[PDB]
Write a structure and sequence with these properties.
homodimer; about 100 residues; alpha/beta; Alpha-Beta Plaits; 4-stranded parallel β-sheet; globular; Septum site-determining protein MinC (chains A, B)
C-alpha cells in the first residue's frame, strides 16, 4: 500500500550573500522581474553558506516569502543557533549535490 | 548579492498506492515504526502516480501530515483537478529523476 524510495530532483537554489535586509529584498525583486519564467512563485532551496553569523532568520524568511518564493528547505547552514531557528519553523535542512 | 543556481538533491519519495484512507494511515504508521531513522519527521515528496482518479486531496494531505511527514511537493500527478487542489495549498508539483 506504501513504498519508500530515493530519487534525484533538480531544484532551484537561491544563493544568498551577506547584505542588508532591504538590499536582499531589492535584489530578489529585480531577479524576479529579470527572470519571471524561472522565479515567479518558484519553489526554491535557500543557500545560506554566503551569510555571516549571526543570521536573523525570522526576518530573512519573511523577506524571501514576501516576494512569492516558496522555501522548500535551506542548504549550507553551519551555524548551530541558525539551525534551531530553521527547525522552529519546521523547514528541512538539505544537502546539495552536483550542479544541474 | 543574490545568485540563482540549479542543483541535484536526493529526496525521499513516498509512493502511495490506491487504498482506503484508514489503510493508508495504518501503513504509514507501521513504516514509521519499522524505519524510524528514515521516516520520523521525514521531509518527503509524495508520489501519487499509483492512485486512481478522483483523489480526495485535502483528506489525504491531512492523513500524511498527521503522521509527521513533511510534504516537500507532489510527483506523478496527471489528473488536472488533482493539480488544482494541490496548488490551492501552494505545494510544488515536482518531476522525479533517476533512482538514488
Amino acid at each position: 500500500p506504501i513504498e519508500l524510495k530515493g530519487s534525484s530532483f533538480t531544484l532551484s537554489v537561491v544563493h544568498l550573500h551577506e547584505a542588508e535586509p532591504e538590499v536582499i529584498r531589492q535584489a530578489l525583486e529585480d531577479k524576479i522581474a529579470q527572470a519571471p519564467a524561472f522565479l515567479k512563485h518558484a519553489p526554491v532551496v535557500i543557500n545560506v553558506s554566503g551569510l555571516e553569523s549571526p543570521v536573523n532568520w525570522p526576518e530573512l524568511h519573511k523577506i524571501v516569502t514576501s516576494t512569492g518564493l516558496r522555501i522548500i528547505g535551506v542548504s549550507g547552514c553551519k551555524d548551530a543557533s541558525l539551525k534551531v531557528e530553521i527547525d522552529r519553523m519546521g523547514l528541512p535542512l538539505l544537502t546539495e549535490g552536483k550542479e544541474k
